[PDB]
Nucleic acid binder design. Structure first.
Ligand SMILES: [Mg+2]
Ligand SMILES: [Mg+2]
Ligand SMILES: [Mg+2]
Ligand SMILES: [Mg+2]
Ligand SMILES: [Mg+2]
Ligand SMILES: [Mg+2]
Ligand SMILES: [Mg+2]
Ligand SMILES: [Mg+2]
Ligand SMILES: [Mg+2]
Ligand SMILES: [Mg+2]
Ligand SMILES: [Mg+2]
Ligand SMILES: [Mg+2]
Ligand SMILES: [Mg+2]
Ligand SMILES: [Mg+2]
Ligand SMILES: [Mg+2]
Ligand SMILES: [Mg+2]
Ligand SMILES: [Mg+2]
Ligand SMILES: [Mg+2]
Ligand SMILES: [Mg+2]
Ligand SMILES: [Mg+2]
Ligand SMILES: [Mg+2]
Ligand SMILES: [Mg+2]
Ligand SMILES: [Mg+2]
Ligand SMILES: [Mg+2]
Ligand SMILES: [Mg+2]
Ligand SMILES: [Mg+2]
Ligand SMILES: [Mg+2]
Ligand SMILES: [Mg+2]
Ligand SMILES: [Mg+2]
Ligand SMILES: [Mg+2]
Ligand SMILES: [Mg+2]
Ligand SMILES: [Mg+2]
Ligand SMILES: [Mg+2]
Ligand SMILES: [Mg+2]
Ligand SMILES: [Mg+2]
Ligand SMILES: [Mg+2]
Ligand SMILES: [Mg+2]
Ligand SMILES: [Mg+2]
Ligand SMILES: [Mg+2]
Ligand SMILES: [Mg+2]
Ligand SMILES: [Mg+2]
Ligand SMILES: [Mg+2]
Ligand SMILES: [Mg+2]
Ligand SMILES: [Mg+2]
Ligand SMILES: [Mg+2]
Ligand SMILES: [Mg+2]
Ligand SMILES: [Mg+2]
Ligand SMILES: [Mg+2]
Ligand SMILES: [Mg+2]
Ligand SMILES: [Mg+2]
Ligand SMILES: [Mg+2]
Ligand SMILES: [Mg+2]
Ligand SMILES: [Mg+2]
Ligand SMILES: [Mg+2]
Ligand SMILES: [Mg+2]
Ligand SMILES: [Mg+2]
Ligand SMILES: [Mg+2]
Ligand SMILES: [Mg+2]
Ligand SMILES: [Mg+2]
Ligand SMILES: [Mg+2]
Ligand SMILES: [Mg+2]
Ligand SMILES: [Mg+2]
Ligand SMILES: [Mg+2]
Ligand SMILES: [Mg+2]
Ligand SMILES: [Mg+2]
Lengths: 158, 134, 265
RNA sequence: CGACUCUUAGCGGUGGAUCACUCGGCUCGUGCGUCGAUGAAGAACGCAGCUAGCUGCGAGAAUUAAUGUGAAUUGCAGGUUGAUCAUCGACACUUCGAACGCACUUGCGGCCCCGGGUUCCUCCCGGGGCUACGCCUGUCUGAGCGUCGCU
RNA sequence: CGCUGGCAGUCGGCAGAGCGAGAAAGAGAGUGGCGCGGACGCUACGCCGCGACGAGUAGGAGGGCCGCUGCGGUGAGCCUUGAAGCCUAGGGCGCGGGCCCGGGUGGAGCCGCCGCAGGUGCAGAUCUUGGUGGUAGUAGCAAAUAUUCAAACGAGAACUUUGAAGGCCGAAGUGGAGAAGGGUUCCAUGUGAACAGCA
RNA sequence: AAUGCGAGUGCCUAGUGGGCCACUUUUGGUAAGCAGAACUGGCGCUGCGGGAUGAACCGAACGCCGGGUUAAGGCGCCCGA
RNA sequence: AAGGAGUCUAACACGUGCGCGAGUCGGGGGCUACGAAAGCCGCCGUGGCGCAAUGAAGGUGAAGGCCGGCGGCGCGCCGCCGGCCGAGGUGGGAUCCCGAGGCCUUCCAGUCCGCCGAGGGCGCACCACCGGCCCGUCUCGCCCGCCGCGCCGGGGAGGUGG
RNA sequence: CGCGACCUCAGAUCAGACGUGGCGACCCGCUGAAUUUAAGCAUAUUAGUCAGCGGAGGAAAAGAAACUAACCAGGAUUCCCUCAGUAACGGCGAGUGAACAGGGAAGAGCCCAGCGCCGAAUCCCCGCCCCGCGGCGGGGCGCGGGAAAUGUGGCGUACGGAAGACCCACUCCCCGGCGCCGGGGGGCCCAAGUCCUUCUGAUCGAGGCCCAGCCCGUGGACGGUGUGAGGCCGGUAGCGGCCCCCGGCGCGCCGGGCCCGGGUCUUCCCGGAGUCGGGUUGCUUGGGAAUGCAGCCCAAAGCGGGUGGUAAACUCCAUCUAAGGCUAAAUACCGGCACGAGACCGAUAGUCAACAAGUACCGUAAGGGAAAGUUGAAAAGAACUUUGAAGAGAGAGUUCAAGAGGGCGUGAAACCGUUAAGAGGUAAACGGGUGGGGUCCGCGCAGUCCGCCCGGAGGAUUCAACCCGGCGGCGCGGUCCGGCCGUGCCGGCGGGGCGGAUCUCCCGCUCCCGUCGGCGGGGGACCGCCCCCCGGCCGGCGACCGGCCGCCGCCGGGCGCAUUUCCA
């Protein structure tokens, strides 16, 4: 029976909700597990960055967010083709690639091309054979100063 | 303070593992201190007690300057029977009064091939700790 | 357990049979036969409103109030009467913001810590902790809370070069980093005024963590010290000031008790 | 005064409350996350010097071997080249059970190989190995007035 | 309950001790004609003074230095020179909830204060479980004709055993054998604790 | 105009929603300790003195006490007078 | 004798305490024995709620007044460019401001510090009312704009619904 | 007639393999209610939930768009926050109820069929030789056997691909052994009091341990030991040690494979059918002229098809490529193994089960299902004497204690026995008021002290005042010298850090010819605040003072020799 004044409330507690109750008492336990897995991965890829491959400059759709910019899934094949990077070799040097992306504009395309060029200038590439250097790789003075990057590679700022 | 996450501080768990310990664990549990004459000679503070050890009581009714051979090491009630610590029953038959090994101090060890090795292991591991401190 | 008191199969005998209509255990040649199964009043059975795991155990407190309580607990530790009323034996302590030098962090033996606490005249608090070590009262002894004592002085350090190992075996001594100050250890029991021993590298970062009233905190994003509701709090000196005293009426301190009415007739 | 009855106290019974203990639960969290035709889970029946239950084990039956440890087990007897415990990687593991020769009475077989019997002559007895269903690949033996080719 | 009353003025030899009185306002400043002394107070969430008032079901609110259990602090708390619990024709306090001492019993832990938390207070629910009364040494040990004498064993005999009687079942039996079911109840010896509603 | 009294205002809100009795007015009914209304007071929710007894009648409403005096009733004895 | 019955979670309302304040909140994530705690992040404030309402919706979206010059209507109005003033008023209203005069010691003038006070004011919050503005809708109407001169867009006055 | 192929189909205790069943907390595929709510009830709600059935794994499932969107566009799946109790569904009642965008946790992509080109270039099995040999593999032979042209393998898959030619560029990828180089499991061990007095039945209690403040402490967690132990013992701490086993991370070598790419033109090729889709029926969904699924009927196309949240026609757009397949992680876990912890319960509680508990017992059965902890520190568990047939006693003895005597810690209430006291014909009990008798208490039975003064008997190493030294208080020392602070204020031929939606030499990259314009990036200037040095006042030192000086107070030591002062 309703009281004098109040809301008409519709609580969704008419099923057997007490069977499917999810408690969060293992939340500080899963945070430590995720942190230990993150640090184990970061030690497994020792000079590679801990965040992973570099993500491209991406506009957001759906007019509430069309002014912001974001990290996307991968660089498009048009962007890699203009930058001069083969699509099956880009994933070996930490460039994230997805083939689904299109390039409607020119300004975002050239921005991601410049993004690829500046990452390629910053890439310190170790020889495939450690005892013998190769042609397209870094010299020995840069490998001894090569460290591990923390956080996202070339962070995206509005 | 204990920092090992795999060692328990639970009272019931420690009481359970103590009172349901296997016999070779009860041997290490039922250890006795050495006298100060043997301590300076062997550099060993305590040893597990054996059957043929001469030992001296320091606590209870039977404490004094008397030294007795262990009659037996009855590890089921966590206790030893020593040579002259005994009690007359009603009928006149004497039975051994049990003393805990922690309330009794060894004045003479029974030296076997293994118990020399135990003293040497304890002495080496004490001198490694002394060298680590120094 | 949610199955407690409900693992039985039982149905009420109903009216008739001169029994009180409670559910009863089905059949059998045993003691548990028509014996009363469900309900809070019955032996065995299920309790009234069984406790559930999804009770709100945790509370969240606003960050500004947590910092405000940290500031109030820290400012109360530099006052004499408030640390005396916490019971800490500090009658021979030379200064109440007890600040020591930075070689204290390089201590690695507890003998150095004990000797430092004796030279700072703080060892009488550890003696009071030793005198206050006793057994607990009640059911906490069989729930791994058998021995209780008194919280002693708190030692605050900037960097750890062995000071936690040097001090951690002394009963009552707790160690807190400057950047990780805990209200639960700065004011144990909810009462302000715990005795604190600082180092100078510890003492020179409080103006960086909290700021003054004109310079904001540099290690926090945007935190200032809270404002005072009342600047001069010594209302005795406020009240017997000539500014206030001239603008008062005369005090009417004469007691006029009741008059016994005599009959004039 | 006495019997009986009522009240209170002392002491004694009946009863097992209260309190103090706790090798037990409940809840939360972590790591691992592994059964079976090479016979699982479950069940039955046995096994100890004196042994009913519980526990452990399987005719090698409160255990064998190996390794670690190092002088006991124990309620009573009996007897360091390693007693007892723990680990367990070797060996062993009765009957029913998906349960497997046919059935479920603990009944009836069939084939092969051995030992007594006999002196390969089949009987009889004892022992051992095979003998379930479905299905995959291959083999062997076949069927068809199925489609043909040739004598 | 109201006076949304009064008291920071304990203003002391750096002193002058007051604001109850019918009549808005200052015991105001300047400018010219010896003896070293003086109770209590004020946990201001405290203390003090005047009046008026006091019923209570359902119900609502406030205060509990009322009570139980556990946690964070705190009593340089209590304790084998005796804790908890229990008993008491003992001494008391509080309107009350309740509490503190004395004696005895007992043998190992317990409490006060400031906060926190709850599975936190019983006279009832034909409440649950366990225990015990009156009834009450009462109802009752009454279906199927019946027992008696002597002896033995034994601490003990109406009931056991043996003998002598008197009886019954009276061949569709109170006889002699099986099936189902039972599972050692069969047989020998010993016991008389418990059972065989007397023994 | 007299008399008397400090008022005004806003939220949240339990319980209740079977009633009954009496003077007067009054409907149906032969009538009812019957059924149904109006007004006010009670009982319910409330003890106390009296009506011997007593939900409602008369008096009077209640913190724990001492002294005095009354109300409604009473003052042969029970039983104060 | 013992056990024994308004509990826990979620949602909402109102009151109360705290912190910050047109903002506030890390609850999710990440960094770095008690501690599964505490601390920190600010280009982790995404996001929630509040700061703007109204209409079914397309949509729209919260003072004006005076003066000078110009154009039109026949001294006022409308439209058009420049200047200045500017967030309403009436009544009640705690508090606060001024002060005619006065608060004694022998007697008058006589400055400063206070205290009271006739009368007069600025008026907090809040209430009643009258106006004003925003959105929907109705009625009466005359005008202004240009890139598309139009079944275009924008405005005025008077009621009324939120 | 016979013989030989192929097809289709049989039988074998043929040779070699595989499946069955269990558990099932979490997962996948079906099937599937009614209690209940709607204050009735039938649609709805309960709820795609309980029950039923099948199938797995350490996770499962899902998963690299026939997608979201309508934007300046994003870009596999799974999970968290928010969207959101919203759009929407609903006797539009009760109630039900998503998705996108955004922020994160994690992040990984791929392979066929077709279409084509390569001498079937491919795969399986048996015999022998040597090696590996405890997850049955490697090379070498076999005029050995099969599978496969009704299509195996290599290239190749929607992100395009293939082939030829032109150019540029590759000499190092994978696995298996041999042997060598620095996390997990197990075993053993490592500090310091039984030091002196003292309580006890026993101490782990209490007191002390000098100037190494008893000793150790990277060890003061816990447990045991005759109460309550850092130092008696096991342990605990420690990037502590020693000894085995397994695995990972690497190097050298042998036997093998693989004999490889990128770019611009040119010529070719390119897709999954009783499936999409349509009608209808039934279930389902928030999905509403039909969200998904399924039965029946109809039944495709290739500038095609699907989607574009209102049915339909026309016309543009946008976006994917269905009808084939694989894939870790973040996520779930009341079952199992092994652990740790607790503001939980403390034997009528907590699991039914602290104990010979799914046991005893009941029911033909499916099933139902208890009760039940405590001697003592140590059995030292009561020898022996005596009565009785014995159970039972009486002595004696043990123990600190039998007032702990084998269901024995503490031992309440109800109920009963006895002793003592009091009482008794209106059942008992009760409230108020006294009285009497008891039991104990007041450790009652000559009755309170305190201050001042006077009087009388005494006794001190004694008063005031002065001297010296120390300490404290106050000081408008009108304004003494020196410091410190200021949620104080101004200045500067001052040095610096944060912030700004105040402005502007080199540098990356970009359009047009080393020239010439926009934009990503460090200075540099400006402004605000703060910090540190300088001068000035102001104000404080009562949350925050030092030295001299002055006054006062107190202490200690002198001097005071007693008409002072004090003591009983
Ligand atoms: Mg209501
Ligand atoms: Mg229960
Ligand atoms: Mg208690
Ligand atoms: Mg009695
Ligand atoms: Mg047996
Ligand atoms: Mg062996
Ligand atoms: Mg061995
Ligand atoms: Mg048969
Ligand atoms: Mg009242
Ligand atoms: Mg009593
Ligand atoms: Mg509780
Ligand atoms: Mg009761
Ligand atoms: Mg009778
Ligand atoms: Mg017979
Ligand atoms: Mg017969
Ligand atoms: Mg009998
Ligand atoms: Mg009536
Ligand atoms: Mg009333
Ligand atoms: Mg009345
Ligand atoms: Mg009458
Ligand atoms: Mg009276
Ligand atoms: Mg009368
Ligand atoms: Mg109770
Ligand atoms: Mg509020
Ligand atoms: Mg075969
Ligand atoms: Mg279905
Ligand atoms: Mg209904
Ligand atoms: Mg109903
Ligand atoms: Mg119904
Ligand atoms: Mg199910
Ligand atoms: Mg299966
Ligand atoms: Mg498995
Ligand atoms: Mg999978
Ligand atoms: Mg998505
Ligand atoms: Mg919302
Ligand atoms: Mg309707
Ligand atoms: Mg639904
Ligand atoms: Mg999304
Ligand atoms: Mg991320
Ligand atoms: Mg092919
Ligand atoms: Mg694709
Ligand atoms: Mg102990
Ligand atoms: Mg001591
Ligand atoms: Mg200890
Ligand atoms: Mg000590
Ligand atoms: Mg030790
Ligand atoms: Mg040790
Ligand atoms: Mg260790
Ligand atoms: Mg389909
Ligand atoms: Mg259905
Ligand atoms: Mg439905
Ligand atoms: Mg369209
Ligand atoms: Mg449409
Ligand atoms: Mg596909
Ligand atoms: Mg697919
Ligand atoms: Mg798949
Ligand atoms: Mg923990
Ligand atoms: Mg139980
Ligand atoms: Mg109990
Ligand atoms: Mg007991
Ligand atoms: Mg005793
Ligand atoms: Mg006892
Ligand atoms: Mg005890
Ligand atoms: Mg007892
Ligand atoms: Mg009597």
């Amino acid at each position: 029976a309703p009281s004098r004044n109040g809301m008409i409330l519709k609580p969704h507690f008419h099923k057997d909700w007490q069977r499917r109750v999810a408690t969060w008492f293992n939340q500080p336990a899963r945070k430590i597990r995720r942190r230990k897995a993150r640090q184990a991965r970061a030690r497994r890829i020792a000079p590679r960055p801990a965040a992973g491959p570099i993500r491209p400059i991406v506009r957001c759709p759906t007019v509430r967010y069309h002014t912001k910019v974001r990290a996307g899934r991968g660089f498009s094949l048009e962007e890699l083709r203009v930058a001069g990077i083969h699509k099956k070799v880009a994933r070996t040097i930490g460039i994230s690639v997805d083939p689904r992306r299109r390039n409607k504009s020119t300004e975002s395309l050239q921005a991601n091309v410049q993004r690829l060029k500046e990452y390629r200038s910053k890439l310190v590439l170790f020889p495939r054979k450690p005892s013998a250097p190769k042609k397209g790789d870094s010299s020995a003075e840069e490998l001894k100063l090569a460290t591990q990057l923390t956080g996202p590679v070339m962070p995206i700022r509005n | 303070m204990k920092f090992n996450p795999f060692v328990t501080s639970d009272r019931s768990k420690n009481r359970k593992r103590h009172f349901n310990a296997p016999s070779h664990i009860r041997r290490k549990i039922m250890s006795s201190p050495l006298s100060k004459e043997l301590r300076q000679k062997y550099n060993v503070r305590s040893m597990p007690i054996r059957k043929d050890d001469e030992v001296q009581v320091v606590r209870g009714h039977y404490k004094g300057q008397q030294i007795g051979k262990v009659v037996q090491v009855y590890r089921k009630k966590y206790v030893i029977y020593i040579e002259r610590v005994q009690r007359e029953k009603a009928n006149g038959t004497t039975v051994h009064v049990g003393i805990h090994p922690s309330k009794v101090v060894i004045t003479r060890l029974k030296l076997d091939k293994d118990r020399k090795k135990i003293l040497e292991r304890k002495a080496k591991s004490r001198q490694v700790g002394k060298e680590k401190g120094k | 357990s949610e199955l407690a008191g409900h693992q039985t199969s039982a149905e009420s005998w109903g009216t008739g049979r001169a029994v009180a209509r409670i559910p009863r255990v089905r059949g059998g040649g045993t003691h548990r036969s028509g014996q009363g199964a469900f309900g809070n009043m019955c032996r065995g059975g299920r309790m009234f409103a069984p406790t559930k795991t999804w009770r709100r155990w945790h509370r969240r407190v606003n960050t500004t109030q947590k910092r405000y309580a940290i500031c109030s607990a820290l400012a109360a530790s530099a006052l004499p009467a408030l640390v005396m009323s916490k019971g800490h034996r500090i009658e021979e302590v030379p200064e109440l913001p007890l600040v020591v030098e930075d070689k204290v962090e390089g201590y690695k033996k507890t003998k150095e810590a004990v000797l430092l606490l004796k030279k700072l005249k703080a060892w009488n608090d550890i003696k009071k902790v030793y005198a206050s070590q006793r057994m607990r009262a009640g059911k906490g002894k069989m729930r791994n809370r058998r021995r209780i004592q008194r919280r002693g002085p708190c030692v605050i350090y900037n960097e750890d070069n062995g000071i936690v190992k040097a001090f951690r075996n002394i009963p009552g001594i707790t160690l807190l980093n400057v950047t990780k100050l805990n209200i639960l250890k700065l004011a144990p029991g909810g009462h302000v005024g715990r005795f604190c021993i600082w180092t100078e590298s510890a003492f020179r970062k409080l103006d960086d963590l909290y700021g003054t009233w004109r310079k904001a905190a540099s290690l926090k994003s945007n935190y200032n010290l809270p404002m005072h509701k009342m600047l001069n709090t010594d209302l005795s000196r406020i009240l017997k000031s000539p500014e206030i005293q001239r603008a008062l009426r005369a005090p009417r301190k004469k007691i006029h008790r009741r008059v016994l009415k005599k009959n004039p007739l």
